[PDB]
From a paper:
Fluorogen-activating proteins (FAPs) are a group of unrelated proteins capable of binding to non-protein ligands (fluorogens) and increase the fluorescence quantum yield and/or change spectral properties of these ligands.
To further confirm the recovery of the lipocalin fold by split DiBs, we crystalized the DiB2-split protein. According to size-exclusion chromatography conducted during purification routine of split proteins there were no signs of oligomerization of any kind. The main difference between superimposed monomers from the asymmetric unit is observed in the termini of the two β-strands adjacent to the cleavage site. This confirms that the split system is capable of spontaneous correct self-assembly to form the functional protein.
Residue numbers in the entry:
A (entry chain B): 114 to 176
B (entry chain A): 23 to 109
């Protein structure tokens, strides 16, 4: 399966990763939680690139 | 091949991407469904690919579990497009 970093911040602290089609998408962070600002940005980029963000499951993390 | 029309990071610095990432969110597939506290850890192989370790807590088993993969760039390593296979 394809693994593509479609967006990444300059500090390599937050990444948006997709698989071989728009049914595969991940939000990755160097930290177990992210802020509302980072959330909205990632979601905005996802929607701009034609991903349906209603498909996201918010993974439980310590935090 | 990446999906038609999506961006791919094209000045990728593979060395700064190495180490541990927390999975904040995912589209749900069978392979990951039900797993919590999911991390992805990347390390550089000698052959220039990446080793991938995906770890998560499975509350049904009460156990941490992990799956190991090998990733290769499909072109320039400054282009963040790879393909991963799991063993």
């Amino acid at each position: 399966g394809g693994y593509n970093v479609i967006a990444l911040d300059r500090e390599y602290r937050h990444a948006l990763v997709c698989g071989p089609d728009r049914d595969y998408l991940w939000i990755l962070s160097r930290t177990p939680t992210i802020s509302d600002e980072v959330k909205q940005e990632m979601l905005a980029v996802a929607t701009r690139e034609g991903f349906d963000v209603s498909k996201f499951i918010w993974v439980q993390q310590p935090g | 091949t990446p999906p038609r029309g999506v961006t791919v990071v094209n000045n990728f610095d593979c060395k700064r991407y190495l180490g541990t990432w927390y999975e904040i969110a995912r589209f749900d597939h069978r392979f990951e469904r039900g797993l919590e506290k999911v991390t992805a850890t990347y390390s550089l192989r000698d052959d220039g690919g990446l080793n991938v370790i995906n770890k998560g807590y499975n509350p049904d088993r009460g156990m941490w579990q992990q799956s190991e993969g090998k990733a290769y760039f499909t072109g320039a390593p400054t282009r963040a497009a790879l393909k991963v296979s799991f063993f």
